[PDB]
Design a protein around this ligand. Structure first.
Ligand SMILES: *Cc1c(COP(=O)(O)O)cnc(C)c1O
Ligand SMILES: *Cc1c(COP(=O)(O)O)cnc(C)c1O
Ligand SMILES: N[C@@H](CCCC[NH3+])C(=O)O
Ligand SMILES: N[C@@H](CCCC[NH3+])C(=O)O
Lengths: 419, 419
């Protein structure tokens, strides 16, 4: 992550300390210039299609669109978000793609009505779309027979994944395409390689193989997402030129097979937005539990779910309430936890649930903690567990912080029940 | 769980098949008479205080109150929910207790204003309350030095838990009580024993020991929650008389020490409400992935989080769309998964993430699946991940189904961003 004192960005110690007083706490903060920087790193690709499930605020989608980035929707709600951010299927038919393994009635009606291209991840879904919208423009998401990581576990590919059309089911997919006269626009894979370039080349090689074997004309291919970001000190950042090298080479073999140019999309979520965001939360209780030193804040797993759900590491900094630097202060092994009435509400824990400590300055109630690199799958995963409201979101653009989401209210949630 | 054909309750195969057509899908369904039955099983206790974080709908809180059950709030949102359900601190001061390890400014103002008794789980929180509301009526949540289950992991007790005042910090708690003239109402523990009666007796014994050592007068003690329910075929249900035997014995030793009657609360969440609820979801895509048979529905981990988060088992039944019984139909080992664009969106997985199968009738798109025993920590944990809206909730009371929560809308979530 970034240092709050080194800061070239707007995410400095001084800027962050003042935010809670103005906008409330806890609160999500993003730096627009960090998103623009991530977008620029993928300028070689023909299309950068943001996976908006990583960070869906409509103002951040507007910023993507401003920069020429298109958008992937995985639900009806995300379609409406893309439309509110100014994407427009009537004038630009490929600015929104609807991607999923399933499609429901309302979404079928919406994609048919607006003619939003559909990336189908199951043969059934392709058939349901085709039956109500003959000749629809589609993509095929293919599961190439393998995923990433432990392969017994829930996966983005392989047999223990729900995602995409199994590669040997392609002929049946073609029958459905032919039955409803569907128009094949492209073939897509989303597996995710991070910085494992050998794995990435297997995905690239599988796309070439499968596209060529399928033997259908198409206009584009997609590399999917899965670019990693270094959440921890010293980890390696993605080399985008290397990603481009490998996927462009795959696109070129395909284009040569087809006898015409083939567009190349990349569909990052995390890479574009993770490092741009932080979460500011106030220390409320500090206590000793046997040999553990506990620091409890006012944000919990309903706000940032990653650590509780996956054991995700997020760098943590402390900000003194009075503003004195804690840059060189002595540290104490600290367990950081939330306000929820649930045992799993601990930000410093490993995959599997083991509690762990973090070297941190010795804060007191009133001080703040900053959780770094929460731009991706932070606010987007939030829940209302413990009847806690969606937090406010703030966007920095060259020194100026602006509210891009107001705090949700308990009244708005009760309105659902006061019928 | 219950059989959809054996059904004495309203949760039958016929009743459930019709619900989605009337109220939408997916949808949470509860049977009021099952909650009343669970409440009746704890009639020996002086007070049954519902942990509303297990199932917070205000109509279900109203039903609790109707039955003489009081309520525990763990956030400001839950306080407002209790007030909307008709609980009233002005006339009945102990009908709502605010319980947590942390307290924020807005909650401090609300509990001071309404004089809602506070169950403090950190010395800092007790001090913050006392400073703004001298003489407030409080409980002390004590961590007795041990939890339940793997003790390296995030816990309800022990040193790897954020919950409650460490038992050796009691003297400091007393200093704070004395400084602000706080009025000690009771002492509480929430560890959770399920059907492990030997562990339960350790908790009971710790409460006696700690209350007597602390040496302060009080009016009540609480056993906390943690009564288990048998999610799987053949598991053992709680013996409430056994729970009462052990806690009443602890209450009696304490009452004898104090020289006057001491009230006994129990604070169940899951036990009261889990088996009363189901989740109905439609099959949308059925596919073969290598050697796995996948059945994807329209509800996902944002709706029911348990399996993805913990590997929780929830019984699954299938309902044919045309209504023919699938009671004796042949089964196929099936992996059941959701619509989300996330690999972890699989309902049939073990703790740790391993995909597993479930013997189920061979459904097709259009058929429905029922997830059993989702009354507790189902709707209450829901999120808006993938821009998916909170689901509708339906309450059965003697054969009649009524809407107790309308489906949230994407417009209501966008209203937070259209400033
Ligand atoms: C989540 C998702 C992505 C984004 O994945 P990241 O790791 O955030 O880049 C891209 N494409 C699809 C189809 C997805 O579901
Ligand atoms: C969650 C919680 C409960 C309820 O636990 P269950 O297992 O659902 O009975 C009771 N008391 C407190 C203080 C809680 O946080
Ligand atoms: N959410 C947890 C319940 C924790 C309750 C602790 N008070 C579960 O579903 O098992
Ligand atoms: N929620 C997951 C991201 C999954 C993205 C898959 N398209 C995480 O925070 O790591």
């Amino acid at each position: 992550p970034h240092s709050l004192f080194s800061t070239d960005t707007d995410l400095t110690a001084e800027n962050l300390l003042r935010l809670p007083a103005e906008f409330g706490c806890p609160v999500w903060v993003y730096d627009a210039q960090i998103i623009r920087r991530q977008i620029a790193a993928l300028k070689q690709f023909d299309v950068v299609r943001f996976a908006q499930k990583a960070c869906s605020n409509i103002h951040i989608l507007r910023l993507m669109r401003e920069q020429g980035v298109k958008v992937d929707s995985v639900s009806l709600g995300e379609i409406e978000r893309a439309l509110a951010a100014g994407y427009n299927p009537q004038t630009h038919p490929d600015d929104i793609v609807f991607t999923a393994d399933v499609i429901d009635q309302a979404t079928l009606e919406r994609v048919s009505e607006l003619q939003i291209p559909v990336n189908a991840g199951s043969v059934d879904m392709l058939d349901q779309l085709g039956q109500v919208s003959p000749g629809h423009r589609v993509w095929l998401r293919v599961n190439p027979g393998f995923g990433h990581g432990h392969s017994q576990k829930t996966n983005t590919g392989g047999e223990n994944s729900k995602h995409g059309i199994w590669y040997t089911d392609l002929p049946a997919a073609l029958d459905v395409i032919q039955r409803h006269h569907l128009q094949l626009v492209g073939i897509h894979m989303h597996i995710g390689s991070g910085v494992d370039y050998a794995h990435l080349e297997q995905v690239c090689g599988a796309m070439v193989r499968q596209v060529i074997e399928f033997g259908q004309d198409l206009q584009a291919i997609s590399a999917g997402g899965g670019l990693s970001v270094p959440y921890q000190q010293g980890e390696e950042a993605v080399d985008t030129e290397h990603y481009y090298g490998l996927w462009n080479a795959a696109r070129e073999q395909i284009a040569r097979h087809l006898g015409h140019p083939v567009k190349l999309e990349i569909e990052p979520g995390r890479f574009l937005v993770a490092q741009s965001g932080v979460l500011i939360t106030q220390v409320r209780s500090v206590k000793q539990m046997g040999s553990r030193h506990f620091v409890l804040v006012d944000a919990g797993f309903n706000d940032l779910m990653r650590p509780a759900m996956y054991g995700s590491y997020h760098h943590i900094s402390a900000l003194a309430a009075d503003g004195r630097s804690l840059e060189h202060a002595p540290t104490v092994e600290t367990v950081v936890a939330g306000p929820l009435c649930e045992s799993g509400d601990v930000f410093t824990q490993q995959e599997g649930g083991n509690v762990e400590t973090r070297a941190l300055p010795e804060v007191k109630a009133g001080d703040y903690l900053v959780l770094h690199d929460t731009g991706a799958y932070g606010a987007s995963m939030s829940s209302n567990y413990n009847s806690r409201p969606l937090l406010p979101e703030v966007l920095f653009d060259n020194g100026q912080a602006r509210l891009i989401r107001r705090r949700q209210t308990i009244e708005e949630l009760l309105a659902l029940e006061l019928l």
